[PDB]
């Protein structure tokens, strides 16, 4: 995106790449979305309700068995916000492809530029 | 490694706005106006080293620049508490203090004429940066030195940065009040017409909304140039607490503005604040979406939303607030692309002392900011049509020959307007 | 969602209740005058969100505009106790500081001075309002501002807000006494008159009615306005009981007035508060007094030819009651057929017990308040619309009403609502009737 918004200062100069500019910066608004809404939701959705847990159970923790117990639960929290099953791996997968994806647009866009 | 950010102070305004700004960051990172660490803020989660350089002697020397054409404000910080926050090397000041005269072409014409101490100054922190993340530029549009010399410092970052992002943040005039600046009008079309065409990202700071907000939600009777600079500070400081407060996610200033500027020419970035002045996630997006809590004058649709809550929130509150937020369509988002509305959960700092255990800030992308260009547009035509005080600005480089800057400044907003309106569209 | 109240002050007497409303409400809710609620009022059970608003600060600030054409009420709010307690931006002062002088044609044209600040104020209260009920508009009849400026404020807010009630309290002069405006009539009628076609409901204030009830009931020889300005702050407040009380049924008054109004043009509603003074009072002596005609807040007129009767009752009894003393109560006012209802429909009488706030100190363990649709208000609409034909028949008074745009050409809207009050009063007559239902 970075590179995109710059480029397209750049190359405003010459209107004929305003189009690519312009149909680049809506692909990389769309990604940046996706990607800011998602961290957003493994860090509250996964991290900070893991934290949270732990926290709690530390802090009301008797045990050391009980300590054990909550690493583990905030583990698992973690684990389980994050997609981390063994029944997520789809969704894990088009996660995946998707960072490919827009790792593959970066590269399309950058030679676009060159 | 450190991601370091220049704030650029530029004329009274942005001198002053950038004084009390580092006076609010101090003061939220129990940080000295010597720049000394004060003993309870020996053990701060924040990173400083980003926005402000350690001394010899321990003291944290801001990575500001302050470029003003007239000698009141640099004095006045000179002479403040503050005088040892900034890097002494950082701050260039026009030896020609005749300043710009509320002229924009003035301002211009003294960017210029100050470019060699402003671009060593600029040279000097680039490479003393380790992760130098990009510029801001904090100016006024409606001035003569903020205004021509903020658009000159604006070209010239996108030029000397093309690759690096050029953030501004832009005070846009009073629309509503006769502008004691009767070139105000083409100085804030110059500012719009760089801002769209040669920014990354502008920050619209509306002095019409940042007065409505002072008055309508602070009590003060009046309020002052200096209320609204606290709200300002207390602004930075939130949009420094993804700085300060070390996340998971949108740790940097660039996937910030990843977030918020989908389109390149649409670099408009409204912002907004809380308080001004137990909230729940729910009360606190309640709140936030009363009109007189937004920090942008916008004339139209939401872009996008990001409410950044720092403080003890309770995530299942946040859920819980943005589920009602999404029933309740508390924001209109572009209909050729989904809804951004993100809502990010962090402490505030530990070192400023809230009454309030949760602040909130909203980032809002809004189409009627289009509005807020075309109305500045319209008050350059209201100038230009009446020939107003451009005795002065014929003597002005940018003005000395025609007075096609300001036309084409028209242009550019005009384009802005027009972009933000298509992507107020399909 | 609160179902909000906006409380719209109108001149003189309209602001000077408004600031009492003001402050019985915070005094209801333990709210300070500076709209800080009071460290003793935290726990309160009352719904403050249906009347109040809520301060950034935990301060609860009124929902009340306060909207003058002359300076001298909307300054004495400001410099009063309670000025910190409003937000000073909901005070519209008229630029134009020549107000209505007693006049319905100039309130009429200052309210079209003001037009757009008025519906953009309104506007913007709507937008900070979530499920926003209705505005209340306080004013007087009789007055310049509170007839001329409430018609078109009437006027205006049922074109922008053709969904949302528009309700007024409507003061009407002292018929005792000589109305200082010559004029007077004329105003009252052009306010009748858009009461009658504008307005839902309006609530007829009689000056008479309460000089009436200073002497035979308080005491009061000469009631001052302070006064007259606490009973009318007692009376806002009874208003308020069904949304402060959380009930089973009827908590809104949207949902009373649906209950209330059979009839959409017969909104002219009768007051009555006991006690009205200077033993646990059972349900059946609260009845008991609320049918005295001592107790009764409305100046009708007791023509003997015409057998006015109650359209509907509410009786509204704040304090510890028992319920089965308020069948009793019920049982006898059925038995010694204490009130006489009209003869076109049913009886409609609701009894409401609430509880009182328990920041207001209440002297008398049981309170009771009547409300009453009673066919006798005819009797006021009629020496309204007599006084305007003796004005008008007169040409009395009108020098300044040709001086005002509304009546510089004829007084024809003045003549539309002699017609319509005179109208009124027959129709009030006919729903004493059972031919009411054929009446219009």
Known sequence: RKGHMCNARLLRSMPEFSGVLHHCHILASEMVHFIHQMQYYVTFEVLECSWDELWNRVQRAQDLDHIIAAHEAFLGTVISRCLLDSDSRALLNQLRAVFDQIIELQNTQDAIYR | ?426
């Open chain 2, 1 to 426: 490694m450190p991601r370091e950010i220049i704030t650029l102070q530029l004329g009274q305004c942005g001198n002053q706005i950038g004084f009390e700004f580092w006076k609010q960051l101090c003061a939220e990172h129990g940080i000295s106006p010597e720049g000394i660490v004060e003993e309870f803020a020996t053990e701060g989660t924040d990173r400083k080293d980003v926005f402000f350089y350690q001394a010899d002697d321990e003291h944290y020397i801001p990575r500001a620049v302050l470029l003003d054409l007239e000698p009141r404000v640099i004095h006045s910080i000179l002479n403040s508490p503050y005088a040892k926050l900034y890097n002494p090397e950082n701050i260039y000041l026009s030896e020609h203090g005749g300043g710009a005269g509320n002229n924009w072409a003035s301002g211009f014409s003294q960017g210029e004429k100050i470019h060699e101490d402003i671009f060593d100054i600029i040279d000097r922190e680039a490479d003393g940066s380790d992760s130098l993340e990009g510029f801001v530029l904090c100016h006024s549009i409606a001035g003569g030195t903020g205004s021509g010399l903020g658009s000159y410092l604006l070209e010239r970052l996108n030029d000397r940065y093309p690759k690096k992002l050029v953030q501004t943040y832009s005070v846009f005039p009073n629309q509503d009040e006769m502008s004691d600046v009767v070139v105000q009008p083409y100085n804030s079309l110059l500012t719009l017409k760089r801002l769209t065409q040669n920014a990354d990202c502008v920050v619209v700071l509306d002095n019409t909304a940042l007065n409505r907000i002072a008055t309508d939600r602070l009590h003060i009777q009046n309020p002052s140039f200096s209320q609204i600079n606290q709200l300002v500070s207390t602004i930075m400081s939130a949009s420094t607490t993804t700085l300060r407060y070390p996340g998971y996610m949108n740790n940097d200033l660039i996937g910030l503005i990843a977030s918020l500027i989908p389109t390149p020419r649409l670099h408009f970035l409204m912002t907004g604040y809380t308080p001004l002045t137990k909230t729940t996630v729910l009360d606190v997006m309640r709140r936030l979406l009363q009109p007189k809590n937004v920090m942008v004058s916008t004339g139209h649709c939401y872009i996008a939303i990001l409410n950044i809550i720092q403080g003890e929130v309770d995530p299942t509150q946040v859920h819980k607030s943005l589920q009602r937020i999404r029933e309740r369509k508390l924001a209109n988002f572009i209909p050729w692309g989904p809804a951004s509305i993100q809502v990010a959960l962090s402490r505030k700092s530990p070192y400023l002392p809230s009454a309030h255990r949760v602040s909130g800030l909203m980032m809002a992308n809004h189409t009627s900011i289009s509005s807020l260009f075309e109305s500045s547009c319209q008050q350059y035509d209201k100038l230009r049509k009446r020939e107003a005080f451009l005795e002065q600005f014929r003597k002005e480089d940018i003005f000395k020959e025609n007075f096609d800057e300001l036309d084409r400044s028209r242009e550019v907003v005009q384009e802005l307007i027009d972009e933000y309106h298509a992507a107020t569209r399909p």
